Amino acid sequence: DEALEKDLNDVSKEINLMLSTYAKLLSERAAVDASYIDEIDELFKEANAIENFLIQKREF
Amino acid sequence: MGKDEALEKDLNDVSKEINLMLSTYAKLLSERAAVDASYIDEIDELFKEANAIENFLIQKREFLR
Amino acid sequence: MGKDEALEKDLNDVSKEINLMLSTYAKLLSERAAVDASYIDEIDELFKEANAIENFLIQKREFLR
Amino acid sequence: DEALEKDLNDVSKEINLMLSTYAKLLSERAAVDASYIDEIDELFKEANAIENFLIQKREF
């Protein structure tokens, strides 16, 4: 029984490790997503500003 | 209208669709993060609940013997 | 019933809830991947559409001059 | 005009790079998620097997 209770406790320690590691991983992914969203938004605005300026020149 | 006017209007419609998809996906990601945090916390809580009951029983049986 | 019987039944209910949350989150992740692939492909397609129209106009104006 | 058209093209090349890098990043995240789901499922089954066995002994 002692051996199986230790085995049960060792598995629970492995589970606790996995859960907190994945929780931290999800925390890091959200920060990277936000950074990608900002960079693409900035690039899309740079391209759109050049496009709108050039379109205005051709029309006028 | 001319071919250039039509294509420039198509370009404006494409840029409007891109802007909409970007904000929609950005909002979608924010909803997932709130759901992810909720699921990870509840599952961790359940795992600790089960582990606490086990530790209680193991300790109680130890007093018994 | 005794305190041990009640706690063992609570343990079984906790394990059933854990199994349900795990499969629910696993299924949820699969739905997100299909949506992610769909959004990334459409946005990339829109960006190439706008870039193709730009390249066409740039080439057409080049013939004009 | 030539300078602005180059600037517009350079931004579009930066956008294309960002989109494909993020698409690959999402592809890698799904593979890691699947691996975490398998490991936790295995650990949860190991712990549940030990628990069910011990509960059966105490009852019987």
Residue numbers in the entry:
A (entry chain A), D (entry chain A): 50 to 109
B (entry chain B), C (entry chain B): 47 to 111
Sentences from the paper on this structure:
Meiosis protein TEX12 is an essential component of the synaptonemal complex (SC), which mediates homologous chromosome synapsis. It is also recruited to centrosomes in meiosis, and aberrantly in certain cancers, leading to centrosome dysfunction. Within the SC, TEX12 forms an intertwined complex with SYCE2 that undergoes fibrous assembly, driven by TEX12’s C-terminal tip. TEX12 undergoes conformational change upon C-terminal tip mutations, indicating that the sequence responsible for driving SYCE2-TEX12 assembly within the SC also controls the oligomeric state and conformation of isolated TEX12.
The increased solubility of TEX12 ΔCtip and FFV mutants at high concentrations enabled their crystallisation and structure solution by X-ray crystallography. The tetramer consists of two symmetry-related copies of two unique TEX12 chains that have subtle differences in side-chain positions (r.m.s. deviation = 0.58 Å). The interfaces between symmetry-related and unique chains are distinct, and on the basis of subsequent data, were designated as dimer and tetramer interfaces, respectively. The centre of the TEX12 ΔCtip tetramer, which have named the ‘hinge’ (for subsequent reasons), is characterised by reciprocal salt bridges between R78 and D82 amino-acids, in which extended arginine residues act as struts that provide increased local separation (of approximately 12 Å) between chains of the dimer interface. The hydrophobic core surrounding the hinge includes Y71 residues and is continuous with lateral four-helical bundles at both ends of the molecule. The four-helical bundles are stabilised by heptad interactions between chains in the dimer and tetramer interfaces, which also contribute to hydrophobic cores. Further, the ΔCtip SAXS scattering curve was closely fitted by the ΔCtip tetrameric crystal structure upon addition of the few missing C-terminal amino-acids (χ2 = 1.54), confirming that the ΔCtip crystal structure is representative of its tetrameric structure in solution. Thus, we conclude that TEX12 ΔCtip forms the anti-parallel tetramer observed in its crystal structure, albeit prone to concentration-dependent dissociation, and the same tetrameric structure is stabilised within TEX12 FFV by Ctip coiled-coils ‘tying-off’ both ends of the molecule. TEX12 ΔCtip and LFIL dimers form tetramers through the same interfaces, but lack stabilising Ctip coiled-coils, owing to their deletion (ΔCtip) and disruption (LFIL).
